[PDB]
Amino acid sequence: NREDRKAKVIEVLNKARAMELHAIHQYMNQHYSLDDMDYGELAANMKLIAIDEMRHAENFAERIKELGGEPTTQKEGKVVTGQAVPVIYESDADQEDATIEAYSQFLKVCKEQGDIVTARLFERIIEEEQAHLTYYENIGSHIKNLGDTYLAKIAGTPSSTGTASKGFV
Amino acid sequence: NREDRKAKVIEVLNKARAMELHAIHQYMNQHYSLDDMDYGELAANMKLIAIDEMRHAENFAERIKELGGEPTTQKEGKVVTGQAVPVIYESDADQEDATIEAYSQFLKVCKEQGDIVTARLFERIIEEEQAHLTYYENIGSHIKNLGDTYLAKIAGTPSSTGTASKGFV
Ligand code: FEC
Ligand code: FEC
Ligand SMILES: [Fe+3]
Ligand SMILES: [Fe+3]
Ligand SMILES: [Fe+3]
Ligand SMILES: [Fe+3]
Numbered sequence: 001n002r003e004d005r006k007a008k009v010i011e012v013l014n015k016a017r018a019m020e021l022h023a024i025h026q027y028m029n030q031h032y033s034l035d036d037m038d039y040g041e042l043a044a045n046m047k048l049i050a051i052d053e054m055r056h057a058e059n060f061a062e063r064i065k066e067l068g069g070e071p072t073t074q075k076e077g078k079v080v081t082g083q084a085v086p087v088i089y090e091s092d093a094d095q096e097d098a099t100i101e102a103y104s105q106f107l108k109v110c111k112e113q114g115d116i117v118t119a120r121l122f123e124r125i126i127e128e129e130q131a132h133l134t135y136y137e138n139i140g141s142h143i144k145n146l147g148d149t150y151l152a153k154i155a156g157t158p159s160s161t162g163t164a165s166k167g168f169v
Numbered sequence: 170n171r172e173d174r175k176a177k178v179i180e181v182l183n184k185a186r187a188m189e190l191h192a193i194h195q196y197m198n199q200h201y202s203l204d205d206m207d208y209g210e211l212a213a214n215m216k217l218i219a220i221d222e223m224r225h226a227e228n229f230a231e232r233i234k235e236l237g238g239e240p241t242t243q244k245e246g247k248v249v250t251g252q253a254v255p256v257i258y259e260s261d262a263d264q265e266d267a268t269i270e271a272y273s274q275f276l277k278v279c280k281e282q283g284d285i286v287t288a289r290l291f292e293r294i295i296e297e298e299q300a301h302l303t304y305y306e307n308i309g310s311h312i313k314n315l316g317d318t319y320l321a322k323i324a325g326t327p328s329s330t331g332t333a334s335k336g337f338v
Contacts, residue, residue, distance in 0.1 A: 003172040 005113040010069035012106035013060050013118065016125075019099055020057035021075035024050050026095070029079055030088045039085070039151070040159035042139070046088075047161050049132055056125050063121055085151070089140035096133035100126055174282040179238035181275035182229050182287065185294075188268055189226035190244035193219050195264070198250055199257045206254075208320065209328035211308065216330050218301050225294050232287055254320075258309035265302035269295055 027050040034043035061071035083091065103126050110119035142150045196219040203212035230240035252260060272295050279288040311319045 001173055001176045003176060004170060007172050 005115065006067045006069070009110055009113050009115045009118050010064055010067050012109050013064045013067075014069070014072040015076070016103055016106055016122070017057055017060040017064070018072050018074060018076035019102065020053050020060065021073075022077050022079065023053040023095065023099070024057065025075060025079045027053060027092070029081055030083065030092070033083070033088070034085070035159055037085070038156055039154045040157035041154050042085075043159045044161050045135065049135070051161075052128055052132070056128070059121060059125065063118055067118075086140070086143050089136050089143060093133060093136040093140055096129055096136055100129045100133065103129065174284065175236045175238070178279055178282050178284045178287050179233055179236050181278050182233045182236070183238065183241045184245070185272055185275055185291070186226055186229040186233070187241050187243055187245035188271065189222050189229060190242075191246050191248065192222040192264070192268070193226065194244060194248050196222065196261070198248055199252060199261070202252070202257070203254075204328055207325060208254075208323045209326035210323050212328040213330050214304065218304070220330075221297060221301065225297070228290060228294070232290055236287075255309070255312055258305050258312060262302060262305040262309055265298055265305060269298050269302065272298065 027046055031043050031046040031050060034046055037043075064071045080091065103122050107119050107122040107126070110116075110122060196215050200212055200215040200219060203215055206212075233240045249260065272291050276288055276291040276295070279285075279291060
């Protein structure tokens with residue numbers, strides 16, 4: 001039934017959205033650590049990736065509203081704090097790869113429920129996740145192979161992500 | 170699948186409701202004829218049964234709303250007019266028996282859809298439909314076995330169904 005179809009898509013959309021809220025908090029917590037450690041270029045790209053996750057959360061929420069549902073406000077799982085730099089990139093690569101696997105299953109549900117608009121949304125966001133995955137794998141590999149030589153290059157670099165973002169005040 | 174289940178129950182509820190809307194118009198059409206004939210007692214009971222059907226239509230509508238549906242406004246089947254007195258009871262008896270058969274089917278769907286509240290609503294209404302059936306069966310029999318001897322007894326009796334209907338004005 002139509003209603004049936006909508007409910008099942010809203011469910012995978014809220015599951016995905018919950019994963020995005022987790023990622024925002026997880027990535028920003030690592031950003032606070034990298035910034036504190038004064039590894040500016042690393043801190044900056046971590047925050048830019050977090051902002052892509054914010055955009056995903058928002059796109060998911062907007063489609064949930066188009067389908068008449070209520071966007072979840074709760075993140076999936078727990079944020080790991082106090083990770084060492086190698087652990088940050090290893091676990092973030094792991095998480096990105098798991099997110100792509102999950103969204104790929106959610107997409108198939110969309111296809112089964114005859115929801116082309118939502119499946120296209122998953123497809124576009126999955127391609128962004130792949131860009132995130134490649135990034136994290138590359139940094140992990142530099143840290144693996146080069147160690148402190150690589151740290152020494154990032155030490156003291158600019159941490160700016162650009163102009164402060166649009167706000168009300 | 171909550172939405173499949175609500176949708177399948179709402180479908181038999183709207184089906185039963187359209188059988189009630191037809192019944193209301195069918196029995197009141199016969200009431201106007203009986204009243205015109207001045208067979209008071211028969212006219213009064215025919216309107217009282219119509220009012221019972223109004224209450225069934227309403228109960229079906231309210232449950233449909235609880236389940237998030239839209240109560241139908243269309244009646245099932247055609248109203249037959251100018252029915253003679255023997256045909257009124259014979260046809261009302263047949264229609265009540267057909268309704269009990271239909272609703273026992275609808276009850277079945279409710280139970281299959283795990284809708285206990287709606288199943289109980291049908292069981293309760295089915296027992297009222299049996300009261301109507303018995304009534305029509307008895308009148309048809311008297312008319313068939315005693316003919317005009319029984320009608321002379323009904324002639325000129327009061328047709329009042331009680332105090333005037335609560336209204337806005
Ligand atoms: C959408 C959305 C969500 C999800 C909320 C939801 O419930 O769906 C959302 C969630 C969050 C959450 C948590 C945090 C808090 C992170 C933390 O401290 O753990 C959180 C934090 C930040 N957001 Fe965020 N967001 N977000 C935008 C949209 C969304 N954001 C847009 C747009 C911009 C654009 C800013 C700009 O262009 O200047 C933006 C920028 C930031 C900055 C950057 C500040 C700066 O450099 O000035 C920080 C920090
Ligand atoms: C419920 C409901 C429906 C279905 C509406 C829907 O679309 O769901 C509904 C539908 C109809 C329809 C047609 C008719 C018109 C019949 C015709 O003329 O063919 C129709 C006709 C009558 N209704 Fe009716 N109904 N109905 C109530 C509930 C419902 N009624 C309740 C309650 C009372 C309570 C009256 C009282 O207590 O004084 C009540 C009374 C009457 C009287 C009584 C007049 C009198 O003696 O003053 C007549 C005639
Ligand atoms: Fe994402
Ligand atoms: Fe990502
Ligand atoms: Fe009825
Ligand atoms: Fe009936």
